[PDB]
Design a protein around this ligand. Structure first.
Ligand SMILES: *[C@@H]1O[C@H](CO)[C@@H](O[C@@H]2O[C@H](CO)[C@@H](O)[C@H](O)[C@H]2NC(C)=O)[C@H](O)[C@H]1NC(C)=O
Lengths: 49, 49
């Protein structure tokens, strides 16, 4: 009841899963060498070829 | 118009431009553009030119 920080393993597992998911969803915002990171702009601005 | 070493730079803003009536003009020797498809110049909207 009083002393905390005795449940490290479960918290570590949850943290690892959440952090992996967050970094995966954050990866979507990169440019990857193109001129825009949003696909709608690149489809609506430039010639399909 | 001025010379190449003293090219005339001007700002165009706060107006409803019309490139369709200008693109169809046949008096131009060449008309080559980078980064945008000309047919999609009638729906894009910029801040200043
Ligand atoms: C200067 O103005 C004239 C006339 O306003 C333009 O001439 C037009 O040229 C196009 C293509 O050659 C024609 O389709 C139009 O019919 C012409 N206009 C008229 C009223 O007949 C000329 O293109 C303009 N030049 C510049 C550099 O803007």
């Amino acid at each position: 009841s009083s002393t905390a920080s005795a449940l490290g393993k479960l918290q570590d597992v949850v943290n690892q899963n959440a952090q992996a998911l967050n970094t995966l969803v954050k990866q979507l915002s990169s440019n990857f060498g193109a001129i825009s990171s949003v696909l709608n702009d690149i489809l609506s601005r430039l010639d399909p070829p | 118009f001025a010379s190449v070493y003293a090219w005339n730079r001007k700002r165009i803003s706060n107006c409803v431009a019309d490139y369709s009536v200008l693109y169809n003009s046949a008096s131009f020797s060449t008309f080559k553009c980078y980064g945008v498809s000309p047919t999609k110049l009638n729906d894009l909207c910029f801040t200043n030119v």
